[PDB]
Amino acid sequence: MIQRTPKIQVYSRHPAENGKSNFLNCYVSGFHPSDIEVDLLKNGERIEKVEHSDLSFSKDWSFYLLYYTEFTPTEKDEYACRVNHVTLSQPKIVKWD
């Protein structure tokens, strides 16, 4: 068996074909096992509506998840990604910078 803690990166992106749109992204990479729970947060509250969740694997024991959705951030709101995995004794929260 093998278990690897996921790398977690939170960032925003504007699709070039529609610059006005902004998307909040949580890229969870290189983890194993595949079982996982991931949420985007807005001011500590779970965002129920997340339009995209793309899962893939490279080696049979390495998974990747891109979890993102459109959003409209303001200088007053705080965004983050919360991840729960067997390798994390406590859920890991990575804030969006």
Interface residues with Na ion (CB under 5 A) are 88
Residue closer to Na ion, measured from CB, 9 or 33: 33
Least distance in angstroms from the C-beta of 5 to Na ion: 10
Query: Could you tell me if 9 and 94 are in contact, meaning their C-beta atoms sit under 8 angstroms apart?
Result: yes
Residue closer to Na ion, measured from CB, 31 or 71: 31
> Residue 16: which region, alpha, beta or left (left: phi > 0; alpha: psi -120 to 50)?
alpha
Least distance in angstroms from the C-beta of 51 to Na ion: 26
Other CB atoms within 10 A of residue 30 CB: 15
Least distance in angstroms from the C-beta of 72 to Na ion: 31
Residue closer to Na ion, measured from CB, 67 or 71: 67
Q: Which residue is nearest to Na ion (CB)?
A: 88
| Cβ-Cβ contacts under 8 Å for 92 (sequence gap 6 or more) | 8, 82, 83, 84, 85
